[PDB]
Amino acid sequence: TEKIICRDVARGYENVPIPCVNGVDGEPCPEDYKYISENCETSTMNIDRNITHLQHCTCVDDCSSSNCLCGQLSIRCWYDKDGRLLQEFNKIEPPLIFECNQACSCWRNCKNRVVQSGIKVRLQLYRTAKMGWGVRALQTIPQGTFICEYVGELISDAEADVREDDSYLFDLDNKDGEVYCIDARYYGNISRFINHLCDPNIIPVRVFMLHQDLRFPRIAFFSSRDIRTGEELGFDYGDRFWDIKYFTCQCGSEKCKHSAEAIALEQS
């Protein structure tokens, strides 16, 4: 039978509790990491936090106009009235989102402040059948809804290359510059338990909020379609992960590109 291992893995740091359940085996709630709601540093990253370096808008409205400088920096503001990404949003090659900040003239509740307002959907940490821990939806989630942020430890490329466990690295590669990582192995949030799906229902987006240091985008997961209740969330880890990894994909999708069956067909 299924039991509640923990009422809130986030210890009240989120807008909503993120409980933990297991109805598959006798493995307890994971405790081999530190839950953090916001990205942390373990060495000086010299993030540019200078308020005068912030590009901002002069909006006296709710930032719903074509004239919002912040919306313009993002090509257009991609959020609708309810905070969901527009259907026209490029899901394959997504643009950078520049949310409003503390230097804008607008209010804290303007239409360009979705990711900075945190988690709004009901999520659950649960034990899967062949992928260990996973994250599923406790409610129906419409397409373009913000889910959560890929929160971890901000580390350099030189540091990522010295780490034994690389199963929690998110790459932050820019146009023509530096390489920085988010490692969610020692420090991370709920997104560290999101598994790979060959048919994914969430997409990662590079977002800027309180700072605009281009070497440090924050990763926001948005639904890439309508998600049913109980449905497991997942994004494509990329071919680099499957080229690196010892274990085959257990997503079980009919359109699975990284199963042992699919791998053996490609080699043949």
Ligand X SMILES: Nc1ncnc2c1ncn2[C@@H]1O[C@H](CSCC[C@H](N)C(=O)O)[C@@H](O)[C@H]1O
Ligand Y SMILES: COc1cc2c(NC3CCN(C(C)C)CC3)nc(C3CCCCC3)nc2cc1OCCCN1CCCC1
* Residues within the interface to its own copies (CB under 8 A): 8, 11-13, 34, 36-38, 40-46, 49-52, 102-103, 106-109, 153, 187
Nearest to 170 by CA among 126, 144, 222, 205: 205
Identity of the residue, 69 or 179, whose beta carbon is nearer to ligand Y in the bound complex: 179
Cβ contacts of 8 within 8 Å, gap of 6 or more: 14, 17, 18, 19
> Restricting to residues 157-216, which ones interact with Zn ion according to CB under 5 A?
198
Give the one entry of Zn ion, ligand Y, ligand X, none that residue 59 binds, where binding means its C-beta sits below a cut-off of 5 to 8 angstroms depending on kind: Zn ion
21 CB-contact burial (10 Å; exposed 0-12 / middle 13-18 / buried 19+): middle
**Residue 50 beta carbon to its own copies: minimum distance, rounded to whole angstroms:** 6
Binding site for ligand X (CB under 6 A): 131-134, 167-168, 193, 195-196, 245, 247, 249-251
In what helix (H) or strand (E) does residue 70 lie, and over which residues does it extend?
helix 69-73
Establish how many alpha carbons lie within 13 A of residue 224's alpha carbon, considering only the half-sphere containing its beta carbon.
18
**Residue 224 beta carbon to ligand Y: minimum distance, rounded to whole angstroms:** 16
Nearest to 215 by CA among 239, 253, 247, 182: 182
Question: CA-CA distance, 132 to 97, in Å (whole number)?
Answer: 32
> Restricting to residues 223-242, which ones interact with ligand Y according to CB under 6 A?
237-238, 240-241
Identity of the residue, 71 or 188, whose beta carbon is nearer to ligand Y in the bound complex: 188
**Residue 266 beta carbon to ligand X: minimum distance, rounded to whole angstroms:** 17
Give the one entry of Zn ion, ligand X, its own copies, none that residue 33 binds, where binding means its C-beta sits below a cut-off of 5 to 8 angstroms depending on kind: none
Q: How many CB atoms lie within 10 A of CB 224?
A: 18
> Restricting to residues 98-157, which ones interact with ligand Y according to CB under 6 A?
157
Q: Where are the alpha helices (DSSP H) in 142-221?
A: 157-160
Identity of the residue, 78 or 150, whose beta carbon is nearer to ligand X in the bound complex: 150
**Residue 38 beta carbon to its own copies: minimum distance, rounded to whole angstroms:** 7
201 assigned ligand-binding residue = no
